[PDB]
Amino acid sequence: SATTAPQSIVHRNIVYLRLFPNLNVFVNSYSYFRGSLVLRLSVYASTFNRGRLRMGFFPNATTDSTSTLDNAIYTICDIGSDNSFEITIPYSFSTWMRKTNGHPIGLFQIEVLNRLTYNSSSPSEVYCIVQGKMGQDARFFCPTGSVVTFQ
Amino acid sequence: SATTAPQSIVHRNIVYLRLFPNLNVFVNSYSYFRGSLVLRLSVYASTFNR
Amino acid sequence: SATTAPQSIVHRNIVYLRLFPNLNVFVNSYSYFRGSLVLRLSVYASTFNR
Amino acid sequence: TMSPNELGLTSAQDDGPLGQEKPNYFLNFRSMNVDIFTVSHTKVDNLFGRAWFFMEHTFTNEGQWRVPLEFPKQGHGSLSLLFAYFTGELNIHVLFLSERGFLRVAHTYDTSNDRVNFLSSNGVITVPAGEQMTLSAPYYSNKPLRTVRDNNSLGYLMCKPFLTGTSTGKIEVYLSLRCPNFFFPLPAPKVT
Amino acid sequence: TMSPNELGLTSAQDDGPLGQEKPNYFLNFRSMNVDIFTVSHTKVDNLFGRAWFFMEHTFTNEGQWRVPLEFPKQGHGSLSLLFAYFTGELNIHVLFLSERGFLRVAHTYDTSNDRVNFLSSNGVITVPAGEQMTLSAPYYSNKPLRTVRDNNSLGYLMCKPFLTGTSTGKIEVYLSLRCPNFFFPLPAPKVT
Amino acid sequence: TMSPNELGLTSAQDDGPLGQEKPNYFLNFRSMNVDIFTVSHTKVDNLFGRAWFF
Amino acid sequence: VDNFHSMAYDITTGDKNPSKLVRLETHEWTPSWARGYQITHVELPKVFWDHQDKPAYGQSRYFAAVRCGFHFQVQVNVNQGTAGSALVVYEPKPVVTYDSKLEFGAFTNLPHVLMNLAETTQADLCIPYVADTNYVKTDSSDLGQLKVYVWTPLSIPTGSANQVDVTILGSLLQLDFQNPRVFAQDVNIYD
Amino acid sequence: VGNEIGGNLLTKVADDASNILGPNCFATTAEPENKNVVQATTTVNTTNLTQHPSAPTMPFSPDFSNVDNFHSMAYDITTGDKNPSKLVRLETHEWTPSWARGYQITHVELPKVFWDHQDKPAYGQSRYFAAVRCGFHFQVQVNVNQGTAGSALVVYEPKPVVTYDSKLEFGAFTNLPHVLMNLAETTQADLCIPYVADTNYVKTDSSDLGQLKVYVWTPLSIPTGSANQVDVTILGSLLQLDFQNPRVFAQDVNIYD
Amino acid sequence: VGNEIGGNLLTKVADDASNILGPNCFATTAEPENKNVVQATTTVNTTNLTQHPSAPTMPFSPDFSN
RNA sequence: AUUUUU
RNA sequence: AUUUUU
Known part of the structure; x- marks a missing residue:
């Protein structure tokens, strides 16, 4: 939203594999895994709307609190024709293989960099969608019991 | 401005080298010169203005 | 001295070229310079001291 | 060199056809594939090659046990729910818990009872x-493909125990599949 | 052939890097370079190779004259104000107006008095x-470059006249530089 | 390679004869000779070649 | 070296980390600001150690001398309906010192980017080490500072938004910390 | 097929109706300087995506080598980089006389000790990373006059040992990288310890990866006149250092499960 | 002449000011996936004209022999 | 259907 | 530093 300050947060939360439909299935199947994770933010605005948004990610972070992303893996998004920016998170754990359901993937934060601008015939706020998938180096290892029941 | 008639003037004046910061320096240094002069008008409008 | 604690200071000061006889001469002759400076500490103890 | 497309700047409406193994990079990073085991545990043949509990039946008489075999929404076999069609060998593991007797086991895709x-x-x-x-x-089905979801996606299993005296018991059944052919992956399932 | 870019149609936001000798044409016109003299008067070495008044001092005793040499915001030397840094030989022209005596002259970049x-x-x-x-x-400066603006951009000049009798006078000083090295041109100066 | 003598460990009583241009080093360091002028101002002929009041 | 790469990153990640691109500033382009008006500035080079949350803040504290190159990316986003232009220019200490003595409109002589809004959303500036001294004292405003001026005020239509933000990002093309010193203690490399 | 032909449909026409005085008109068509392109820039763990880029600028005939050819700073160019691996004083305790054998003189939290205080060369970087993988080079120094005698056991104890320390038999600790150093004979001990743990990486600011200790092999036999204040110092250098996981400033992050 | 040079005026500069640790920045410029094109499709006695086309999609390793 | 394994 | 001149 245009109202959101040039530093306020538009979205913040701790990311887990289970937060993703496709992945959550593997989470309930395999016990461990490894590889990079890719998140793709798709902001659906009009051809008139313009602005920037920086989304960072602190690997294995647990404290759900807004924090400067200058040192975090971030991606600045400048609205244009291709309004679907991505961000990759290289495998990061103390082990060669990590729990598919255990420690968080990290802190995901999308802060406002430049207020969403608009005009008389354009929206003052737009909708955004965050998707997630595994990298080309993704792997899963041990199959374990189930933690949930699908339908 | 949109109001300005299709023939009215938006700017008119007699040009001298001293009217330019960089050039005015040479004007106060050298006595003579020669060569062509280039003026660049930059109108800052929106993508809708025509 | 043996008394001096394992972290206490035995000597501290700001170093200037003039603090050295030979160098102080150049200090009073030349205006500038460059290069590395070498300081050699010589502790005169007995063969038993460690 | 690297294009801006491979650096994160893309368009969601230009993803078709389905299945684009596009590489993603940035300075100080590149897709690194490191293996821990001599083989994959993600391959359909391997993963599903391992059984999983199905159901249990407690018999008292010599009656027959007819049960619509289906894919699990419970164990690691749930990964099948990501697909729409199946076809191939079906491994059925049966445990006959009885003191003295025999257990007749059979399987068919034929719906007729x-x-x-x-x-x-x-x-x-x-x-x-x-x-x-x-x-x-074997895939003795009258349908080229088995919708993976159907309450009878897998053919029916029959169990007619041949008991001798008053002896009774229970038949626990678990199952896996041999080399599975899955097609047209559908959206991920929901949770209960 | 000629592109529309070279015909006047351009974009001010696409000028970087600094220093684009782009040619401008139109029918019945082309950049014509005609020389009147055997050499350039715009070259830094030539222009600045010519002195310009600096300041004057009227002495009465044998005292010393210390003065922070700086670039002129007054004569043709002002063209230096278009730059930020300088380095090179410095030509100092001194006129000793006295009846009977001698004038000691010296120069240093050392700030110590x-x-x-x-x-x-x-x-x-x-x-x-x-x-x-x-x-x-010579460039006997302790700083690789001399900010061109500083009230002491150029090193200090010393003048200790050795007079003999009651004689007094005045020392007019003007100066130029030998081969000057200017860097990083800054915006043009304002007027008083 | 570098000996411990050239790393700072020496003995003051083993300096004679007079005039030992021994090199001193340590990791990330080496005697770097950079000149600013075309000639030396330390040479006796040059320095003293310039007068001084008497 | 972990042959399993339990940490998928470049081995020299930690080393290069301090040269990483960071947000140096973000001010709001207040409408009704005449030409020449200074939108926002940035203390160069001490701004890269602006807060203890800056990747370079760590090392910068153990060294008094610095010699580095910059790569700025001033970003300004404005809807199509609106128009305007800003002057992103680098001003070495010499300029910053005598700023009032310089004629605006001539600042185009310095590495700049007249960027016409509604046309460009970001400006790029590659600035090498520029000073009258071989090295600059760490935690100093020397080596100049980057500024953003109002070339032509914002012409914001009635319905269009009126809160334009100007952001300054910075990356170190090349960094070099030499003089050792106590933790964040003012040391004079100059005479 | 049209919409660009403006150049050769005006440039030619005149070239077709030109007299000895040549053409009376020239027309050229091309693409604008501001084209429809997208630029992407990546710095350390960062990616800037711009869809409205502009021609990058730079000073006149610039030099980006950034290296001072005069070396006004005589040091290695990679000094700042290697600085954190520099040798530092990790500890200095006093060998209190009358301390039976086996008694622990002093310990040292490995590897978080290299960031012991904000005055540690490695303290700076260590704060911007949660994961660490490094090798060590210790130099335990103990000086004692010739008249006196004694011996201390400098040994490295991985987390496994530190955890179950009381369950281990002293006198067998010689199985671990150690240095039975006999005083009055040696004044310093050297220990090269590689990354040792049951996990690929160790959480920064943690006691994991074990810790170095100094025990009393045989108590100090200090004669009457001889001095009685023996100090034991532990110095540490990083043979190889590696900070990977990014994180907020000095914020506890769990790399473990 | 400008407005695209963003890639080799940033990719080179770093490649010119790089140390043993290599460049500290890489920049690449190109055309957007959504370019200014027009698509035309004709079926039996029909013609569909679209000036805002998108990348056509299809199932995994599909067989259209039907 | 190296759709047991190489 | 053809950063005196050719």
């Missing part, structure tokens, strides 16, 4: 009391 | 009374 009344040629393997067998039922 | 109290090795050239000399002071 009368072609099973006899068990003539439906694979009547015999597991002696207190024993257990693993029979691999 | 005590290294000058003596004049040991600061270049004590001698201009006899009523004479004038042009000494070229």
Whole structure:
């Protein structure tokens, strides 16, 4: 939203594999895994709307609190024709293989960099969608019991 | 401005080298010169203005 | 001295070229310079001291 | 060199056809594939090659046990729910918990409940009391593909125990598949 | 052929890097370079190779004259104000207007006012009374570059006249530079 | 390679004869000779070649 | 070296980390600001150690001398309906010192980017080490500072938004910390 | 097929109706300087995506080598980089006389000790990373006059040992990288310890990866006149250092499960 | 002449000011996936004209022999 | 259907 | 530093 300050947060939360439909299935199947994770933010605005948004990610972070992303893996998004920016998170754990359901993937934060601008015939706020998938180096290892029941 | 008639003037004046910061320096240094002069008008409008 | 604690200071000061006889001469002759400076500490103890 | 497309700047409406193994990079990063085991545990043949519990039946008489075999929404086999169609060998693991007797086991994709009344040629393997067998039922289906979801996606299993005295018991059944052919992956399932 | 870019149609936001010698044309026109003199008067070495007044000092005693040399915001030397840094030889022109005596002249970039109290090795050239000399002071600066603007951009000049009787006078000083190295041109100056 | 003598460990009583241009080093360091002028101002002929009041 | 790469990153990640691109500033382009008006500035080079949350803040504290190159990316986003232009220019200490003595409109002589809004959303500036001294004292405003001026005020239509933000990002093309010193203690490399 | 032909449909026409005085008109068509392109820039763990880029600028005939050819700073160019691996004083305790054998003189939290205080060369970087993988080079120094005698056991104890320390038999600790150093004979001990743990990486600011200790092999036999204040110092250098996981400033992050 | 040079005026500069640790920045410029094109499709006695086309999609390793 | 394994 | 001149 245009109202959101040039530093306020538009979205913040701790990311887990289970937060993703496709992945959550593997989470309930395999016990461990490894590889990079890719998140793709798709902001659906009009051809008139313009602005920037920086989304960072602190690997294995647990404290759900807004924090400067200058040192975090971030991606600045400048609205244009291709309004679907991505961000990759290289495998990061103390082990060669990590729990598919255990420690968080990290802190995901999308802060406002430049207020969403608009005009008389354009929206003052737009909708955004965050998707997630595994990298080309993704792997899963041990199959374990189930933690949930699908339908 | 949109109001300005299709023939009215938006700017008119007699040009001298001293009217330019960089050039005015040479004007106060050298006595003579020669060569062509280039003026660049930059109108800052929106993508809708025509 | 043996008394001096394992972290206490035995000597501290700001170093200037003039603090050295030979160098102080150049200090009073030349205006500038460059290069590395070498300081050699010589502790005169007995063969038993460690 | 690297294009801006491979650096994160893309368009969601230009993803078709389905299945684009596009590489993603940035300075100080590149897709690194490191293996821990001599083989993959993600391959359909391997993963599903491992059984998973299905259901249990407690018998008292010599009656027959007819049950619509289906894919699990419970174990690691749930990964099948990501697909729409299946076809291939089916491994059925049966445990005959009985003191003294025999267990007739058979399998068919035929929906008719009368072609099973006899068990003539439906694979009547015999597991002696207190024993257990693993029979691999072929794709004897009348349908080229098995919608993976159907309450009978997998063919029906038959169990007619041949008891001798008042002896009774229970038949626990778990199962896996041999080389599975899955097609047209559908959206991920929901949770209960 | 000629592109529309070279015909006047351009974009101010696409000028970087700095220094684009783009040609401008239109029918019946082309950049014509005609020379009137055998050499350039725009070259830094030539222009600045010509002195310009600096300041004057009227002496009565044998005292010393210390003055922070700086670039002019007054003569043709002002063209230097278009730059930020300088380095190179410095030509100092001194006129010793006196009836009977001698004028000691020296130059240093050293800010200390005590290294000058003596004049040991600061270049004590001698201009006899009523004479004038042009000494070229080397870049004996402790700073690789001289911000061109500083009230002491150029090193300090020393003048200790050695008079003989009640004689007094005035020392007019003007200066130029030998081969000047200017860097990083800054915006044009304002007027008073 | 570098000996411990050239790393700072020496003995003051083993300096004679007079005039030992021994090199001193340590990791990330080496005697770097950079000149600013075309000639030396330390040479006796040059320095003293310039007068001084008497 | 972990042959399993339990940490998928470049081995020299930690080393290069301090040269990483960071947000140096973000001010709001207040409408009704005449031409020449200074939108926002940035203390160069001490701004890269602006807060203890800056990747370079760590090392910068153990060294008094610095010699580095910059790569700025001033970003300004404005809807199509609106128009305007800003002057992103680098001003060495010499300029910053005598700023009032310089004629605006001539600042185009310095590495700049007249960027016409509604046309460009970001400006790029590659600035090498520029000073009258070989090295600059760490935690100093020396080596100049980057500024953003109002070339032509914002012409914001009635319905269009009126809160334009100007952001300054910075990356170190090349960094070099030499003089050792106590933790964040003012040391004079100059005479 | 049209919409660009403006150049050769005006440039030619005149070239077709030109007299000895040549053409009276020239027309050229091309693409604008501001084209429809997208630029992407990546710095350390960062990616800037711009869809409205502009021609990058730079000073006149610039030099980006950034290296001072005069070396006004005589040091290695990679000094700042290697600085954190520099040798530092990790500890200095006093060998209190009358301390039976086996008694622990002093310990040292490995590897978080290298960031012991904000005055540690490695303290700076260590704060911007949660994961660490490094090798060590210790130099335990103990000086004692010739008249006196004694011996201390400098040994490295991985987390496994530190955890179950009381369950281990002293006198067998010689199985671990150690240095039975006999005083009055040696004044310093050297220990090269590689990354040792049951996990690929160790959480920064953690006691994991074990810790170095100094025990009393045989108590100090200090004669009457001889001095009685023996100090034991532990110095540490990083043979190889590696900070990977990014994180907020000095914020506890769990790399473990 | 400008407005695209963003890639080799940033990719080179770093490649010019790089140390043993290599460049500290890489920049690449190109055309957007959504370019200014027009698509035309004709079926039996029909013609569909679209000036805002998108990348056509299809199932995994599909067989259209039908 | 190296859709047991190489 | 043809950063005196050719």
